[PDB]
């Protein structure tokens, strides 16, 4: 998922904004209440129909809006195709209109979904992930940088595995498999050639059933695939910890021990036991590792103020490793009110009083 353009009117603290995204790193910088996290949540909402801070969709409308209406336009690329979402949220009338279009080579647009529910479903299908997965992995909200790190084991596995598989495809495959089985059950239910034909059907039924169990029983392939995914992600995460902490900190996953277990010079520690700044540094390393391993699937990496808990030395260390990501064909955005950190990066997007300056 590669963001390309975002237009926002009267959404949260934003009045009117129109931005274009670029590969590499951009730091969104501005004071408290500027509209930085409003931009972050506009993207979340454009895609999935929900933001972060409010459960109620109409609460996202900028209460200063004369017409009581928020408008979002979000353009992004995925898998060599270009898409555009338009949403209008009217808090006065309590209406929420949404549409998803493909932008064809000619530049013309062809709608492929209308209405919030269908737009959401089609975005999930296109992106291959759900909203929770998006915000726990590579699109990290303010105050929630460490949420994946301290999550319970079942949420960790659901989330990390979601990044690397398509539920829609698997859902279709399971339905097709079951329908074939049911058809054979029907046929079987109702000479050399006939004996061979009944056995052919029995064997096919039993083979479909065997395949069904290996593929779809949780304890079989799914468990193994999740393990393969975690191994790849943690291998990279360990490499970052090694660099960032001079060999001190290690990370592993263990369902029985409560999820992510950190070792401090060999001594095991639940992730939640780490200090505030340690959790920020390790969560950023994990997130960075996920973003790298997920290239091609998810081509964005946003962190909304995951930096304030870092002391001077760790902030510098973190900025240095993050800057290495500049070489990647990824849209990378860090949001901060903190000049100490924004100064480490070349390209900036400044926001103040709900507009870009």
């Amino acid at each position: 998922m590669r963001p390309e353009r975002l237009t926002v009117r009267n959404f949260l603290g934003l009045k009117n904004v129109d931005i274009e995204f670029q590969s590499g790193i951009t730091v969104v910088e501005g004071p408290n209440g500027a509209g930085k996290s409003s931009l972050f949540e506009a993207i979340s909402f454009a895609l999935f129909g929900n933001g972060i801070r409010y459960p109620n969709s109409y609460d996202y409308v900028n209460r200063n809006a004369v017409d009581g209406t928020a408008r979002l336009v979000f353009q992004f690329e995925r898998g060599g195709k270009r898409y555009e979402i338009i949403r209008e949220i009217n808090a006065l009338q309590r209406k929420h209109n949404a549409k998803l279009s493909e932008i064809l080579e000619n530049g013309k647009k062809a709608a492929i979904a209308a209405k919030p529910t269908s737009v959401k479903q089609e975005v999930e299908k296109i992106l291959g992930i759900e909203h929770r997965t998006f915000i726990r992995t590579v699109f990290l909200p303010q105050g929630e940088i460490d949420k994946l790190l301290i999550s319970p084991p079942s949420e960790i596995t659901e989330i990390i595995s979601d990044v690397f598989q398509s539920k829609e495809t698997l859902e279709k495959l399971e339905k097709l498999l079951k329908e074939k089985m049911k058809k054979l059950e029907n046929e079987i239910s109702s000479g050399g050639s006939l004996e061979k034909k009944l056995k052919e059907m029995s064997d096919e039924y039993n083979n479909l059933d065997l395949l069904r169990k290996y593929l779809f029983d949780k304890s079989n392939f799914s468990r193994y695939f999740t393990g393969r995914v975690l191994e790849a992600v943690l291998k990279r995460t360990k490499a970052y910890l090694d660099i960032l902490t001079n060999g001190r900190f290690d990370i592993d996953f263990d369902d029985e021990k409560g999820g992510f277990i950190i070792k401090d010079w060999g001594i095991e520690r639940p992730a939640r036991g780490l200090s505030g700044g340690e959790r920020a540094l390790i969560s950023i390393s994990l997130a960075m590792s996920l973003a790298e391993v997920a290239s091609g699937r998810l081509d964005a990496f946003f962190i909304d103020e995951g930096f304030s808990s870092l002391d001077t030395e760790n902030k510098e260390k973190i900025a240095s490793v993050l800057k290495e990501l500049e070489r990647l064909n990824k849209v990378i955005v860090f949001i901060t009110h903190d000049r100490e950190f924004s100064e480490a990066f070349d390209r900036k997007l400044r926001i103040t009083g709900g507009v870009v300056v």
């Binding site: 690397f164 398509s166 279709k172 495959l173 097709l176 593929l215 193994y224 695939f225 790849a232 391993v293």
Partner: protein, 35 residues
């Protein structure tokens, strides 16, 4: 990283008669895509 590529390896290491099973899988996948 590829889900079905990993599955194929997984199945061959668990099922002596993995040839038939993977044949069926390809047919199913073909239909899902084509559909």
């Amino acid at each position: 990283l590829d889900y079905f590529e990993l599955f194929k390896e997984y199945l061959k290491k668990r099922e002596e008669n993995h040839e038939k099973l993977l044949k069926i899988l390809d047919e199913l996948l073909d239909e899902v895509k084509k559909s």
